[PDB]
Design a protein around this ligand. Structure first.
Ligand SMILES: COc1cccc2cc(C(=N)N)sc12
Ligand SMILES: COc1cccc2cc(C(=N)N)sc12
Ligand SMILES: [Cl-]
Ligand SMILES: [Cl-]
Ligand SMILES: [Mg+2]
Ligand SMILES: [Mg+2]
Ligand SMILES: [Mg+2]
Ligand SMILES: [Mg+2]
Lengths: 12, 231, 231, 12
């Protein structure tokens, strides 16, 4: 799935 | 709790060690133990708590998406794909419930400063959002509204009490805009929020030191990354 | 065991799903349950077992090295660094003991073909080697000799029963050479083993198909990578 | 620590 930018560690 | 016998300061020290060792489940367990000592958290401690659980839930979200995609494609191989997707989903929900439990007992009610209260309410919105990502039951609408309500309270406080470049305010707006885009099915609200947030921060950059400038522009770039994908 | 009620085939299916989801702790638990059904493992199943535990113990080894380095540097901040390094070390030893337990009950004693017996004895050497990496007690010498003995039995069988390009034989020689270099303090034995293994495989490549050629040269490159660092 | 090449997943 296309995941958009969210705050903090890009851990997924 | 299994951390009940360890000193608060020792738990925080070990959380930092665990972060260095990329042992995020340990890091989260240590920070949960520190929260349960009952004292309020400093800025650094709040960020240790958030980083720990963000890494844990991030691994679960990534795994859940892989399994959900395999499951969708498969919809004969038996019940195993559904069963294992359910197992990971239940573990993910457990982590979200744990974080929400810490916020409700009693981090939010003791948080009076804008920087702490907005931080925790943003977290509450975030973990209801992660629950919403996997929700399919008659509770999905209520989970979504719980995320919205937490984000909205955080937004109201942040607009009144923080400058538009404040990195906590910016990260809240970033996450609330993503909530709008793909949880609330409100792409127009998402784009509007991202644009106004970016533009109001840009106009306030002139007030900042070089270091604060760097902190603010980092999150502004994330807003712009999303706007580029959305428009 | 908690996997006692799940079908063998379902455990293997879920191990493959867990691998796709990068859920290696789950993958290892599923494969442990499959081993405990008591049937021998196929080639694919053996590799699922090894990949699962290699990923789990790899995360632990990396974390242990980070903490050990911090501990060495610190040698006042209190007992916390030592305590947390010990916690990770104990978990690592537990994983190694679990794998060694599966090999001893009863994978090795039922493994009669070279491909299975060498594979399991190599694993036994590997997990004693991982125990040796963290050993400091009066048991260190015996742990090292347990690794050596397992590797040596695997080597003797592989030289008699497998061609010099066999990828299992090659990976065994690779790991035994690293055992020599940094566990046994025998860099000369390590270099000699790596060189002879590489040269004898090179002379046998002409017998192989394009696909087998690719499998063998991949591990030969690892031998050469080590030789380059060692000479 | 400098880690040498061994078989399988480079997971550490
Ligand atoms: C005041 O401290 C912080 C502010 C913002 C982020 C952040 C991240 C930290 C960490 N990942 N160990 S501490 C900290
Ligand atoms: C016969 O099957 C195999 C041979 C060698 C490696 C290997 C890795 C596998 C996996 N990582 N799922 S299966 C498999
Ligand atoms: Cl399952
Ligand atoms: Cl500890
Ligand atoms: Mg469910
Ligand atoms: Mg429009
Ligand atoms: Mg110990
Ligand atoms: Mg010499």
């Amino acid at each position: 799935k296309l995941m958009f930018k969210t705050e903090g560690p890009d851990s997924d | 709790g299994a951390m009940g016998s360890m000193e608060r300061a020792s738990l925080i020290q070990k959380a930092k060690l665990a972060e260095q060792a990329e042992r995020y489940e340990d890091m989260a367990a240590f920070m949960k133990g520190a929260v349960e000592k009952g004292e309020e958290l400093s800025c650094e401690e709040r960020n240790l708590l958030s980083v720990a659980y963000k890494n844990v839930v991030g691994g679960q979200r990534a795994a859940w998406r892989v399994l959900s995609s395999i499951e969708q494609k498969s919809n004969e191989k038996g019940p195993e794909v559904r069963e294992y997707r359910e197992k990971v989903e239940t573990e993910l929900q457990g982590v979200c419930d744990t974080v929400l439990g810490l916020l409700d007992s009693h981090l939010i009610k003791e948080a009076g400063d804008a920087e702490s209260r907005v931080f925790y309410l943003k977290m509450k919105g975030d973990y209801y959002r992660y629950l919403a990502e996997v929700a399919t039951g008659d509770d999905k609408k209520r989970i979504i509204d719980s995320a919205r309500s937490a984000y909205q309270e955080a937004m109201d406080i942040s607009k009144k009490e923080m400058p538009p470049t404040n990195p906590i305010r910016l990260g809240l707006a970033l996450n609330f805009s993503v909530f709008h885009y793909e949880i609330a099915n409100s792409p127009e609200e998402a784009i509007s929020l991202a644009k106004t947030t970016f533009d109001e921060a840009m106009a306030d950059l002139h007030t900042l030191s070089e270091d604060s400038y760097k902190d603010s522009t980092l999150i502004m770039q994330l807003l712009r990354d999303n706007l580029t994908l959305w428009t």
